[PDB]
mmCIF file of C-alpha atoms in Angstrom:
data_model
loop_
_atom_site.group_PDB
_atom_site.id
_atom_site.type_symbol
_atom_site.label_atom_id
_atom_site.label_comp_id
_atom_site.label_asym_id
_atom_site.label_seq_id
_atom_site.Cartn_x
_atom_site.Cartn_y
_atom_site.Cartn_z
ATOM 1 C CA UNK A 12 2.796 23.326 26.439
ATOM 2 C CA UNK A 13 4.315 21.923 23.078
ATOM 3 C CA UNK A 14 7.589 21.446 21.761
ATOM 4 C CA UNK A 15 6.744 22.605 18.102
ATOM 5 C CA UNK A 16 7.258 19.974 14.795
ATOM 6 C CA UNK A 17 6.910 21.348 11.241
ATOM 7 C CA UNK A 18 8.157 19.056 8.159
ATOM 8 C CA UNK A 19 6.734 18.640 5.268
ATOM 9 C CA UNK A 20 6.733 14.814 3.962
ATOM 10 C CA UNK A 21 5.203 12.914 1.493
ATOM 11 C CA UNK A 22 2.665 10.144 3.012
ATOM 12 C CA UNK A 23 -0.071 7.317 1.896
ATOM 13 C CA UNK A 24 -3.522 7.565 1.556
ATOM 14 C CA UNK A 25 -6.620 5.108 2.791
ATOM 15 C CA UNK A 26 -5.632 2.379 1.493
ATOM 16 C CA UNK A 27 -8.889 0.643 0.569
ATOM 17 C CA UNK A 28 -10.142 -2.433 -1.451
ATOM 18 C CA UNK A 29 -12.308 -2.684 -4.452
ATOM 19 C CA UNK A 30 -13.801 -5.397 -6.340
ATOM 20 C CA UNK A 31 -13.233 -8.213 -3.868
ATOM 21 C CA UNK A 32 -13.005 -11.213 -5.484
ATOM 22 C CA UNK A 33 -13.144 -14.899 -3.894
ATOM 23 C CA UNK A 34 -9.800 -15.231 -4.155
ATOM 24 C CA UNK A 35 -8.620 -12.070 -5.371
ATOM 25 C CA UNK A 36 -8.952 -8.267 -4.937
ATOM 26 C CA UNK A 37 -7.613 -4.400 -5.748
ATOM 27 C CA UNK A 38 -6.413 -1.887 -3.900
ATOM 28 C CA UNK A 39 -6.038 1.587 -4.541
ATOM 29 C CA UNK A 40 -3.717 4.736 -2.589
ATOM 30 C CA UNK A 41 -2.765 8.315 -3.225
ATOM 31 C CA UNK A 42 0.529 9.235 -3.130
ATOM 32 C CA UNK A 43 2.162 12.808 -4.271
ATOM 33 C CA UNK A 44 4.904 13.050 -7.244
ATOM 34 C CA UNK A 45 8.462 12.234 -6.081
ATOM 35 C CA UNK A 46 7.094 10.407 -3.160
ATOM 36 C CA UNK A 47 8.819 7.309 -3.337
ATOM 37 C CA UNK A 48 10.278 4.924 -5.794
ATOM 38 C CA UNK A 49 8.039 1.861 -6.047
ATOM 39 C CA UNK A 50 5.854 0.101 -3.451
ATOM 40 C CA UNK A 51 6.359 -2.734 -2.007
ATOM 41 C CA UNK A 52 3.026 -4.444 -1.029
ATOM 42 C CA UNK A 53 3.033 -7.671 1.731
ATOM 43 C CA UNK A 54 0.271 -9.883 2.285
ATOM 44 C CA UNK A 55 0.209 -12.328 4.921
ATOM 45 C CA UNK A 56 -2.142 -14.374 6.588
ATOM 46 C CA UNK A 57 -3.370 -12.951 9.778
ATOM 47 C CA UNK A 58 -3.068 -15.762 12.545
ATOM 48 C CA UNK A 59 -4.301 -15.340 16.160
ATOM 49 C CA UNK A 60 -1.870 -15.623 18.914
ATOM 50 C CA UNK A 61 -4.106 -17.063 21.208
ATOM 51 C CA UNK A 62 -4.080 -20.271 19.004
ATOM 52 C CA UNK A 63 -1.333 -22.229 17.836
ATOM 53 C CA UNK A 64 0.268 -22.231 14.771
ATOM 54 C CA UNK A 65 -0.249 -24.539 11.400
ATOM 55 C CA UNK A 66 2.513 -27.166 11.008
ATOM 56 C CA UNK A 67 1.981 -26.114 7.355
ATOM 57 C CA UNK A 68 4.084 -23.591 5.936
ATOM 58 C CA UNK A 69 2.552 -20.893 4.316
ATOM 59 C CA UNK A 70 4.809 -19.148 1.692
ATOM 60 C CA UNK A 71 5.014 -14.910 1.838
ATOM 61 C CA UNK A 72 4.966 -12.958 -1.196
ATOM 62 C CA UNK A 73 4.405 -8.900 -2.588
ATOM 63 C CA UNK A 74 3.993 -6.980 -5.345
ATOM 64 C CA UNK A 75 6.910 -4.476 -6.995
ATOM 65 C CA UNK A 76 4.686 -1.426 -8.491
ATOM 66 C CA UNK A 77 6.243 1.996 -9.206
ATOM 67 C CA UNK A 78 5.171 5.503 -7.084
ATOM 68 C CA UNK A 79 3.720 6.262 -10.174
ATOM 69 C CA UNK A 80 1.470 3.433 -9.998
ATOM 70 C CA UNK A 81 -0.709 2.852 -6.663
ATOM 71 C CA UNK A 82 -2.157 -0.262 -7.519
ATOM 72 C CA UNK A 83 -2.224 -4.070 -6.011
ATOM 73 C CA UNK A 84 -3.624 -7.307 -7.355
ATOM 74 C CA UNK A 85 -3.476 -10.274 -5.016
ATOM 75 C CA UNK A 86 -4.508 -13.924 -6.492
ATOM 76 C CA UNK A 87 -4.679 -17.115 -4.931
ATOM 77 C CA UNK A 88 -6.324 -16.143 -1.915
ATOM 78 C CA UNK A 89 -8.376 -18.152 0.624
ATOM 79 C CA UNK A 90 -12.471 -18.064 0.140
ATOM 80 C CA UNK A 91 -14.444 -15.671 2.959
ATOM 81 C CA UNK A 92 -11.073 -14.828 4.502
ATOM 82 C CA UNK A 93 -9.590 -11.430 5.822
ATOM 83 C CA UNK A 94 -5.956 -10.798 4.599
ATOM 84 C CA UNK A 95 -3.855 -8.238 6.178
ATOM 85 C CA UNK A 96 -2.171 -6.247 3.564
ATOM 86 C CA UNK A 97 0.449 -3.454 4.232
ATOM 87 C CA UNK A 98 2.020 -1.377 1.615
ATOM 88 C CA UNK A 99 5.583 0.403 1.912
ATOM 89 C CA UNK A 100 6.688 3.532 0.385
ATOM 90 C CA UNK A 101 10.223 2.891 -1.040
ATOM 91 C CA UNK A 102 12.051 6.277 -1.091
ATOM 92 C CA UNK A 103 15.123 4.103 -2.195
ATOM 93 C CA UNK A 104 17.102 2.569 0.055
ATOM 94 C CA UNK A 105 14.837 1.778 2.479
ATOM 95 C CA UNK A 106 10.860 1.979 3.373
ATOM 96 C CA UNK A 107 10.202 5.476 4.410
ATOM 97 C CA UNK A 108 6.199 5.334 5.248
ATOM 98 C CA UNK A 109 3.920 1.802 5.877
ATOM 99 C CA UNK A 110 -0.254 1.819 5.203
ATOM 100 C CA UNK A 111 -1.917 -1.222 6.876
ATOM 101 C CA UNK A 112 -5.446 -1.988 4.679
ATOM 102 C CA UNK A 113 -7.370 -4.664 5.625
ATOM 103 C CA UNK A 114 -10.084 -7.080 3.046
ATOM 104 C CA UNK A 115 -12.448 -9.830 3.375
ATOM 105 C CA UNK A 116 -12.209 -11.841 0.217
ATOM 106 C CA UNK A 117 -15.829 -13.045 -1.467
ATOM 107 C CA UNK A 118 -17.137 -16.298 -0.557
ATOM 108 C CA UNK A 119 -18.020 -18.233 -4.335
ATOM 109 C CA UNK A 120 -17.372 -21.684 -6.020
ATOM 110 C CA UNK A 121 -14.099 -23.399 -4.844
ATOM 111 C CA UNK A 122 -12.574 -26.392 -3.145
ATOM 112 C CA UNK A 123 -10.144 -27.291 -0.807
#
Protein backbone atom coordinates (compact mmCIF):
# COMPACT_ATOMS: atom_id res chain seq x y z
CA UNK A 1 0.00 0.00 0.00
CA UNK A 2 2.33 2.90 -1.31
CA UNK A 3 3.04 4.37 -4.48
CA UNK A 4 6.91 4.76 -3.91
CA UNK A 5 8.77 8.58 -4.02
CA UNK A 6 12.59 8.81 -3.98
CA UNK A 7 14.32 12.35 -4.86
CA UNK A 8 16.89 13.73 -3.44
CA UNK A 9 16.49 17.70 -2.81
CA UNK A 10 18.08 20.22 -1.01
CA UNK A 11 15.78 21.67 1.99
CA UNK A 12 15.86 24.26 5.15
CA UNK A 13 16.58 23.67 8.50
CA UNK A 14 14.71 24.89 12.00
CA UNK A 15 14.67 28.02 11.47
CA UNK A 16 15.08 29.48 14.96
CA UNK A 17 15.75 32.90 16.69
CA UNK A 18 18.55 34.07 18.81
CA UNK A 19 19.27 37.07 20.72
CA UNK A 20 15.82 38.63 20.69
CA UNK A 21 16.02 42.03 20.95
CA UNK A 22 13.06 44.63 21.75
CA UNK A 23 12.87 45.53 18.51
CA UNK A 24 15.17 43.40 16.78
CA UNK A 25 16.38 39.76 16.46
CA UNK A 26 18.60 36.85 14.46
CA UNK A 27 17.86 34.00 12.88
CA UNK A 28 19.85 31.22 11.90
CA UNK A 29 19.18 27.93 9.11
CA UNK A 30 21.15 25.14 7.54
CA UNK A 31 21.15 24.76 4.14
CA UNK A 32 23.52 22.30 1.90
CA UNK A 33 26.07 23.75 -0.90
CA UNK A 34 24.37 24.51 -4.24
CA UNK A 35 21.09 24.71 -2.53
CA UNK A 36 19.81 27.81 -3.70
CA UNK A 37 20.92 31.20 -4.77
CA UNK A 38 20.08 33.71 -2.04
CA UNK A 39 17.19 33.86 0.46
CA UNK A 40 14.67 35.86 0.48
CA UNK A 41 13.37 36.47 4.07
CA UNK A 42 9.53 38.19 4.67
CA UNK A 43 8.36 39.52 7.78
CA UNK A 44 4.96 40.59 8.31
CA UNK A 45 2.81 41.36 11.01
CA UNK A 46 0.62 38.56 12.03
CA UNK A 47 -3.08 39.94 12.26
CA UNK A 48 -6.07 37.85 13.47
CA UNK A 49 -8.90 37.30 11.17
CA UNK A 50 -11.37 37.29 13.66
CA UNK A 51 -10.71 41.09 14.15
CA UNK A 52 -10.70 43.74 11.76
CA UNK A 53 -8.07 45.28 10.13
CA UNK A 54 -5.92 48.69 10.97
CA UNK A 55 -6.90 51.62 8.70
CA UNK A 56 -3.11 52.14 8.98
CA UNK A 57 -0.96 50.80 6.45
CA UNK A 58 1.76 48.85 7.46
CA UNK A 59 4.66 48.73 4.90
CA UNK A 60 6.26 44.91 3.97
CA UNK A 61 9.82 44.44 3.62
CA UNK A 62 12.81 41.32 3.45
CA UNK A 63 16.14 40.71 3.48
CA UNK A 64 18.42 39.60 0.15
CA UNK A 65 21.23 37.18 1.79
CA UNK A 66 23.16 34.66 -0.35
CA UNK A 67 22.78 30.46 0.14
CA UNK A 68 26.02 30.88 1.39
CA UNK A 69 24.89 33.00 4.09
CA UNK A 70 21.82 31.78 6.40
CA UNK A 71 21.44 34.71 8.34
CA UNK A 72 18.50 37.47 9.09
CA UNK A 73 18.50 40.72 11.01
CA UNK A 74 15.14 42.40 11.41
CA UNK A 75 15.06 46.14 13.03
CA UNK A 76 12.34 48.31 13.78
CA UNK A 77 10.15 45.92 15.28
CA UNK A 78 7.20 46.33 17.69
CA UNK A 79 8.04 45.85 21.70
CA UNK A 80 6.65 42.23 23.28
CA UNK A 81 5.30 41.32 19.84
CA UNK A 82 5.38 37.95 17.82
CA UNK A 83 6.43 38.44 14.11
CA UNK A 84 5.88 35.79 11.63
CA UNK A 85 8.92 35.37 9.58
CA UNK A 86 9.24 32.98 6.53
CA UNK A 87 12.33 32.46 4.58
CA UNK A 88 12.48 31.28 0.77
CA UNK A 89 15.06 29.29 -0.88
CA UNK A 90 15.78 30.99 -4.28
CA UNK A 91 17.06 28.26 -6.66
CA UNK A 92 16.89 31.13 -9.33
CA UNK A 93 14.04 31.84 -10.98
CA UNK A 94 11.72 31.19 -8.57
CA UNK A 95 11.35 30.04 -4.67
CA UNK A 96 11.91 26.37 -4.61
CA UNK A 97 11.45 25.55 -0.62
CA UNK A 98 9.62 28.10 2.24
CA UNK A 99 10.60 27.75 6.33
CA UNK A 100 7.98 29.52 8.53
CA UNK A 101 9.96 30.61 12.09
CA UNK A 102 8.17 32.31 14.47
CA UNK A 103 9.74 35.16 17.51
CA UNK A 104 8.52 37.13 20.32
CA UNK A 105 10.52 40.29 20.37
CA UNK A 106 11.87 41.54 24.12
CA UNK A 107 9.81 43.87 25.98
CA UNK A 108 12.51 47.07 27.12
CA UNK A 109 12.55 50.96 27.04
CA UNK A 110 10.49 52.48 24.14
CA UNK A 111 7.58 54.67 23.18
CA UNK A 112 4.87 54.84 20.98
Amino acid sequence: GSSGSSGSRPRLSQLSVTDVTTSSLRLNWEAPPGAFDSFLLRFGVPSPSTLEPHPRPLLQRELMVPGTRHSAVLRDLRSGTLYSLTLYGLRGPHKADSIQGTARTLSGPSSG
